[PDB]
């Protein structure tokens, strides 16, 4: 079986490169962030612009939803994170404590914690309610490209330019696992699988790798795309067929069969690097977003 994603909408409005797109857990909304310092909210099914959320003093590299789709967290070059109430547009908290750009952020499944990674080579764990830093992990010796909680929040996965992927115990902060393969390419992305048993990692040698984190073993490899410079998100597509979805530096979206590693589809139409993709939680919908020469978001829909 192969998907048949087709372009349905193109969302313009960001005045600088788009950095990330995320669907809300309830599937109503798409949040996007940009180098233009803005978060934008769009309808997940029609693409109709909802609203703009502002307050960061410099560009935003990442944005992420809370479990109930009520809150966003944004990570910015102004070295802060911000917790936003989506409905009112208010900045509820400004998380200060990184000493360099913040690159990535996520909530835990409870959404009482936020995890952040920074150019200052640290991972930070913040309390959502008070906005105070709970833990500072000296995680890496280079900028941290991604951070992600597992399904129950007991585990944090982080990746860094230093070529390492590390697994941390959320409660204690000890390094439980370090993952690296035959070479040492910079790791540009990582995230847990929806069941929590695997982690998907991207390296800046045109490679996506599905890892069994307990055994410390690389289970699958996905190649054929172009990833050498940019921290490109990748996703597990589970609503239809089980796919691996990723942007690429040749301006295309790539879709692999998860088990066979075969490329099953390429999505064409962006005019710059596809830095970000997200998959809708109930419908076969992909959102993709591209860099400075393109500045748009595209929604694609398929039958499986």
């Amino acid at each position: 079986v192969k998907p048949n994603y087709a372009l349905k909408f193109t969302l313009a409005g960001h005045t600088k490169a788009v950095s990330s797109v995320k669907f809300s857990p309830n599937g109503e909304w798409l949040a996007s962030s940009s180098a233009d310092k803005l978060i934008k909210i769009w309808g997940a099914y029609d693409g109709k612009f909802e609203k703009t959320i502002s307050g960061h003093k410099l560009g935003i590299s990442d944005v992420a939803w809370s479990s109930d789709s009520n809150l966003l967290v944004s990570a910015s070059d102004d070295k802060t994170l911000k917790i936003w109430d989506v409905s009112s547009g208010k900045c509820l908290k400004t998380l200060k404590g990184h000493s360099n750009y913040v690159f990535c952020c996520n909530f835990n499944p409870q959404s009482n914690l936020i995890v952040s990674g920074s150019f200052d080579e640290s991972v930070r764990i913040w309390d959502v309610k008070t906005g105070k830093c709970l833990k500072t992990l000296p995680a890496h010796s280079d900028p941290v490209s991604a951070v992600h909680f597992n399904r129950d929040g007991s585990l944090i996965v982080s990746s860094s330019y230093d070529g390492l992927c590390r697994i941390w115990d959320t409660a204690s902060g000890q390094c439980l696992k370090t993952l690296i393969d035959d070479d040492n390419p910079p790791v540009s992305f990582v995230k847990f699988s929806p069941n929590g048993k695997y982690i998907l990692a991207a390296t800046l040698d045109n490679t996506l790798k599905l890892w069994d984190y307990s055994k410390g073993k690389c289970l699958k490899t996905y190649t054929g795309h172009k990833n050498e410079k940019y921290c490109i998100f990748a996703n597990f597509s589970v609503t239809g067929g089980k796919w691996i979805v990723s942007g690429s530096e040749d301006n295309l979206v790539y879709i692999w069969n998860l088990q066979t590693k075969e490329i099953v589809q390429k999505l064409q139409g962006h005019t710059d690097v596809v830095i970000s993709t997200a998959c809708h939680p109930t419908e076969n919908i992909i959102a993709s977003a591209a860099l400075e020469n393109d500045k748009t978001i595209k929604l694609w829909k398929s039958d499986c």
Partner: peptide, 9 residues
């Protein structure tokens, strides 16, 4: 802008 949209050399 933003570090992600600038990339790594």
């Amino acid at each position: 802008g933003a570090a992600r949209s600038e990339g790594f050399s």
